[PDB]
Amino acid sequence: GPLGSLTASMLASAPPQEQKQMLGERLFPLIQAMHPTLAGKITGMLLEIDNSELLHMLESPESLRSKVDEAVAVLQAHQ
Amino acid sequence: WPPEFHPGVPWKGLQ
């Protein structure tokens, strides 16, 4: 079954580690669809940034793709 | 450089 919908007010009520977990559980599968091997690394990189921006990325496929693309470029240069 | 995220495992990047 699908994970539940995440809103700003819901996210805001949770402890800091829990907010990152809420965001990560939703980001990971979408990122993994794009980059099966780097998914874990990409997701951890993205979780470094602000939760309200991460929530926006979850609400806008275009926004998530753009961020993923930058993270991959960075990882590929390092590897 | 940040810890990888693994579904269903507590992320160690902030805890």
UniProtKB/Swiss-Prot annotation, chain A:
Leader sequence segment: none
What does the similarity note say?
Belongs to the polyadenylate-binding protein type-1 family.
Q: Which domain of life is it from?
A: Eukaryota
Tissue-wise expression: Ubiquitous.
Record PTM text: Phosphorylated by MAPKAPK2.
Q: Where is the PABC domain?
A: 6-79
Q: What else is known?
A: Many viruses shutoff host mRNA translational machinery by inhibiting cellular PABPC1 activity using different mechanisms. Picornaviruses, caliciviruses or lentiviruses encode proteases that cleave PABPC1 at several defined sites in the proline-rich linker region between RRMs and the C-terminal domain. Rotaviruses, gammherpesviruses and bunyamwera virus relocalize PABPC1 from the cytoplasm to the nucleus thus altering its function. Many of these viruses translate their mRNA in a PABPC1-independent manner and are unaffected by host PABPC1 inhibition.
In Swiss-Prot or TrEMBL terms, this protein is called Polyadenylate-binding protein 1
UniProtKB/Swiss-Prot annotation, chain B:
Q: Where is this region: PABPC1-interacting motif-2 (PAM2)?
A: 1-15
User: In which domain of life is the source organism classified?
Assistant: Eukaryota
Q: In which family does this protein belong, per the annotation?
A: Belongs to the GW182 family.
Q: Which proteins does it associate with, and in what oligomeric form?
A: Interacts with one or more of the argonaute family proteins AGO1, AGO2, AGO3 and AGO4. Interacts with PABPC1 and EIF4G1. Interacts with CNOT1; the interaction is direct and mediates the association with the CCR4-NOT complex. Interacts with PAN3; the interaction mediates the association with the PAN complex.
Note what the entry says on domains.
Answer: The silencing domain, also known as C-terminal effector domain (CED), can act in autonomous repression, including both translational inhibition and mRNA degradation.
What exactly does this protein do?
A: Plays a role in RNA-mediated gene silencing by micro-RNAs (miRNAs). Required for miRNA-dependent translational repression of complementary mRNAs by argonaute family proteins. As scaffoldng protein associates with argonaute proteins bound to partially complementary mRNAs and simultaneously can recruit CCR4-NOT and PAN deadenylase complexes.
Protein's UniProt name: Trinucleotide repeat-containing gene 6C protein
Q: Please name the gene that encodes this protein.
A: TNRC6C
Q: Which residues of the full protein are shown?
A: 1592 to 1606 of 1936
